[PDB]
């Protein structure tokens, strides 16, 4: 099949009888006269020109004696033409950042998808995720150098591993030439970053993930075009992968190509268990307002994926509502797996911001979620792009004095962790970082140096989370299911408390309660669906975090007092500025 555009183009390695070489290929369908230069070349054009091959497209020529380990470029005249020394746009590597130029190497082997990487990337499974810029998740404490891939393989995937998370995400790891982009203004779409080592030190990182029982859902940018560095625009010195605001061209088959293999490159040349694309409302509007085009690209690569790759899912963040972006595509299209929550993180952020004596009015922003959660499947997600641009930390979000805000944001948490769908924290927001997230330095850990404190206790609380929120069915179980969400108390604005269940398929019951004022609610009577004894198996408020450990302490009974329209009633101590978890215990 004409699916995998890097099998074949790029800078392989073959054989031409006894005789050993590498089987170039490169891709114009204009140009005139293109040929290769480098180590092996001189740097020189006219020691070895390339064969064109006129049905297909592709320029090239087997070489005999340049070997995996060389720098080269290109050398084309193109539609007229200049002289343009182009970089091979299916570089596996690219040099170092002197010239840009690229590197020979073959394919990296092949990973086969577990059945238990499938099985974590399902709808019923528990899915935390830590979203992480390797650029500056950490650095070197003497020079502030980056770590390395195999740094990171000692340091980060442990500390996920131990922290709970099952999912890890990186930004962009394409080669680009600036840091700024974060990853998503990239170069080399087919190489992994020498920022942090080579492409070998990159997979050993992903093994490494992957041996602790990570994911790893990688940042896939198929709708950012190479603005920089001359790389990819003017290519053949047509139109080639650019149009005719300098975005892509998905019409050519062999644009599409290029990207769908991009996609199959990385799930199974490293061994990649998700993808998420950003920005698709910039990818399809700015005939119709739409850009019918790119919509086509999506819902093909997601069920191309669907049927190649069966076990990697894909990820969307969509900044308008295009309908089913998380829905199949025969009818309305894009056929993403899940979609991030951004109107989740927009209304709980603006309830989490107001001073907690105001909440009462704005309830709203609590319960409208549940309205719209079977329409996607939903992640929700506090990323990195809410927390910078002046847009403060999660913490400095909060209201109160110092003690109020880290409780607040111990509730939000609590909260967070027990509402519908799939979670997402950006390094930092878990240790509550103060600043706003800087990519030109590491993270704020000269916080958790010293006595333990306040910050210890966030850490130890998403942890307690992550573990807790894995383990029990009931809270991951039936996300995207009306079965697993029952209101309890939706309509106390005055005290502004709000409990609900979480069910498993087995009805398993999780009572979540949160009390967003600082004032402490005791003997606070709702009614319930499961009497019996229960018992807290959470508490934000709890002095392991540095709250004040008021709480139920102990088992607590149930009593048949009818309470919102229900026949039996718990009657519990509500912790200020907390959320707590409830189970059943047998009898
Ligand atoms: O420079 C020689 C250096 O070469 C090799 O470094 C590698 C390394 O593998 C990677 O770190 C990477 O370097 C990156 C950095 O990671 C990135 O952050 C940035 O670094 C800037 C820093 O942000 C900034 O602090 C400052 O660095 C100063 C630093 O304060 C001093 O410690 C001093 O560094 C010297 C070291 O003491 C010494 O070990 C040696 O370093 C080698 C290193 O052995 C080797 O691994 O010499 C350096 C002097 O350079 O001075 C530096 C100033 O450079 O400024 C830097 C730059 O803005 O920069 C690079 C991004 O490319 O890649 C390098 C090389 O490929
Ligand atoms: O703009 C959206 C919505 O905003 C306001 O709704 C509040 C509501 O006032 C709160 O009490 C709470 O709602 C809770 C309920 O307490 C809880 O029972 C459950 O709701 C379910 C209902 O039991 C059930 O009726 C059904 O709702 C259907 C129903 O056929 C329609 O009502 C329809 O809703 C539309 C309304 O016609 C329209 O008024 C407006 O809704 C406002 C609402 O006016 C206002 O009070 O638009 C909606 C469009 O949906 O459709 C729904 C099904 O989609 O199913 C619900 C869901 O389980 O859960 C809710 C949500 O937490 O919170 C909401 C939101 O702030």
């Given at each position: 099949?004409?699916?995998?555009?890097?099998?074949?183009?790029?800078?392989?390695?073959?054989?031409?009888?006894?005789?050993?070489?590498?089987?170039?290929?490169?891709?114009?369908?204009?140009?005139?006269?293109?040929?290769?230069?480098?180590?092996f070349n001189?740097?020189?054009?006219?020691?070895?020109?390339?064969?064109?091959?006129?049905?297909?497209?592709?320029?090239?020529?087997?070489?005999?004696?340049?070997?995996?380990?060389?720098?080269?470029?290109?050398?084309?005249?193109?539609?007229?033409?200049n002289?343009?020394?182009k970089?091979?746009?299916?570089?596996?590597?690219?040099?170092?950042?002197?010239?840009?130029?690229?590197?020979?190497?073959?394919?990296?082997?092949?990973?086969?998808?577990?059945?238990?990487?499938?099985?974590?990337?399902?709808?019923?499974?528990?899915?935390?995720?830590?979203?992480?810029?390797?650029?500056?998740?950490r650095?070197?404490?003497?020079?502030?150098?980056?770590?390395?891939?195999?740094?990171?393989?000692?340091?980060?995937?442990?500390?996920?591993?131990?922290?709970?998370?099952?999912?890890?995400?990186?930004?962009?790891?394409?080669?680009?030439?600036?840091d700024?982009?974060?990853?998503?203004?990239?170069t080399?779409?087919?190489?992994?970053?020498?920022?942090?080592?080579?492409?070998?030190?990159?997979?050993?990182?992903?093994?490494?993930?992957?041996?602790?029982?990570?994911?790893?859902?990688?940042?896939?940018?198929?709708?950012?075009?190479?603005?920089?560095?001359?790389?990819?625009?003017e290519?053949?010195?047509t139109?080639?992968?650019?149009?005719?605001?300098?975005?892509?061209?998905?019409?050519?088959?062999?644009?599409?190509?290029?990207?769908?293999?991009?996609?199959?490159?990385?799930?199974?040349?490293?061994?990649?268990?998700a993808?998420?694309?950003?920005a698709?409302?910039?990818?399809?509007?700015?005939?119709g307002?739409?850009?019918?085009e790119?919509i086509?690209?999506?819902?093909?690569?997601?069920?191309?994926?669907?049927?190649?790759?069966?076990?990697?899912?894909?990820?969307?963040?969509?900044?308008?509502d295009?309908?089913?972006?998380?829905?199949?595509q025969?009818?309305?299209?894009?056929?993403?797996?899940?979609?991030?929550?951004?109107?989740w993180?927009?209304d709980?952020?603006?309830?989490m911001?107001?001073?907690?004596?105001?909440?009462?009015?704005?309830?709203?922003?609590?319960?409208?979620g549940?309205?719209?959660?079977?329409?996607?499947?939903?992640?929700?997600?506090?990323?990195?792009?809410?927390?910078?641009?002046?847009?403060?930390?999660?913490?400095?979000r909060?209201?109160?004095?110092?003690?109020?805000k880290?409780?607040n944001?111990?509730?939000?948490?609590?909260?967070?962790?027990?509402?519908?769908?799939?979670?997402?924290?950006?390094?930092?927001?878990?240790?509550?970082?103060?600043?706003?997230?800087?990519?030109?330095?590491s993270?704020?850990?000269?916080?958790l140096?010293?006595?333990?404190?306040?910050?210890?206790?966030?850490?130890?609380?998403?942890?307690?989370?992550?573990?807790?929120?894995?383990?029990?069915?009931?809270?991951?179980?039936?996300?995207?299911?009306?079965?697993?969400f029952?209101?309890?108390?939706?309509?106390?604005?005055?005290?502004?408390?709000?409990?609900?269940?979480?069910?498993?398929?087995?009805?398993?019951?999780?009572?979540?309660?949160?009390?967003?004022?600082?004032?402490?609610?005791?003997?606070?009577?709702?009614?319930?669906?499961?009497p019996g004894?229960?018992?807290?198996?959470?508490?934000?408020?709890?002095?392991?975090?540095?709250?004040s450990?008021?709480?139920?302490?102990?088992?607590?009974?149930?009593?048949?007092?009818?309470?919102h329209?229900?026949?039996?009633?718990?009657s519990?101590?509500?912790?200020?500025?907390?959320?707590?978890?409830?189970?059943?215990?047998?009898?």
């Amino acid at each position: 099949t004409h699916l995998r555009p890097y099998e074949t183009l790029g800078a392989h390695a073959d054989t031409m009888d006894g005789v050993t070489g590498t089987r170039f290929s490169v891709w114009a369908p204009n140009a005139r006269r293109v040929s290769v230069v480098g180590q092996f070349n001189y740097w020189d054009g006219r020691r070895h020109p390339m064969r064109l091959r006129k049905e297909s497209g592709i320029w090239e020529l087997f070489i005999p004696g340049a070997h995996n380990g060389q720098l080269y470029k290109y050398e084309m005249i193109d539609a007229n033409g200049n002289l343009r020394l182009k970089s091979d746009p299916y570089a596996f590597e690219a040099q170092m950042r002197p010239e840009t130029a690229s590197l020979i190497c073959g394919l990296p082997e092949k990973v086969v998808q577990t059945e238990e990487r499938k099985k974590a990337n399902q709808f019923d499974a528990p899915i935390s995720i830590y979203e992480v810029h390797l650029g500056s998740w950490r650095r070197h404490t003497d020079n502030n150098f980056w770590l390395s891939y195999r740094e990171l393989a000692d340091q980060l995937v442990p500390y996920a591993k131990w922290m709970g998370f099952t999912h890890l995400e990186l930004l962009p790891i394409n080669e680009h030439p600036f840091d700024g982009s974060w990853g998503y203004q990239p170069t080399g779409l087919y190489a992994p970053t020498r920022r942090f080592g080579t492409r070998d030190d990159f997979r050993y990182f992903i093994d490494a993930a992957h041996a602790a029982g990570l994911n790893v859902i990688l940042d896939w940018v198929p709708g950012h075009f190479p603005t920089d560095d001359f790389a990819l625009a003017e290519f053949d010195g047509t139109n080639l992968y650019e149009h005719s605001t300098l975005i892509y061209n998905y019409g050519r088959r062999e644009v599409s190509n290029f990207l769908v293999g991009n996609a199959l490159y990385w799930i199974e040349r490293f061994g990649i268990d998700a993808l998420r694309v950003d920005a698709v409302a910039s990818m399809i509007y700015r005939g119709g307002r739409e850009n019918l085009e790119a919509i086509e690209f999506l819902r093909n690569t997601n069920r191309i994926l669907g049927e190649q790759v069966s076990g990697a899912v894909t990820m969307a963040e969509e900044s308008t509502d295009f309908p089913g972006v998380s829905r199949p595509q025969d009818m309305g299209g894009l056929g993403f797996w899940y979609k991030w929550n951004l109107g989740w993180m927009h209304d709980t952020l603006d309830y989490m911001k107001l001073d907690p004596v105001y909440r009462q009015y704005h309830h709203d922003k609590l319960t409208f979620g549940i309205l719209y959660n079977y329409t996607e499947n939903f992640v929700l997600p506090l990323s990195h792009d809410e927390v910078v641009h002046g847009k403060k930390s999660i913490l400095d979000r909060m209201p109160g004095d110092a003690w109020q805000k880290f409780a607040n944001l111990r509730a939000y948490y609590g909260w967070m962790w027990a509402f519908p769908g799939k979670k997402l924290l950006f390094m930092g927001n878990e240790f509550a970082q103060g600043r706003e997230w800087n990519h030109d330095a590491s993270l704020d850990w000269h916080l958790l140096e010293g006595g333990d404190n306040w910050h210890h206790g966030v850490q130890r609380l998403v942890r307690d989370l992550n573990l807790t929120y894995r383990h029990h069915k009931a809270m991951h179980e039936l996300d995207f299911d009306p079965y697993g969400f029952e209101w309890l108390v939706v309509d106390d604005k005055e005290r502004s408390v709000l409990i609900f269940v979480r069910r498993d398929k087995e009805g398993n019951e999780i009572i979540v309660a949160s009390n967003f004022t600082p004032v402490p609610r005791h003997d606070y009577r709702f009614g319930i669906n499961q009497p019996g004894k229960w018992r807290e198996i959470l508490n934000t408020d709890s002095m392991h975090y540095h709250g004040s450990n008021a709480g139920n302490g102990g088992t607590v009974h149930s009593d048949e007092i009818a309470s919102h329209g229900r026949q039996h009633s718990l009657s519990l101590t509500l912790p200020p500025l907390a959320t707590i978890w409830l189970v059943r215990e047998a009898e």
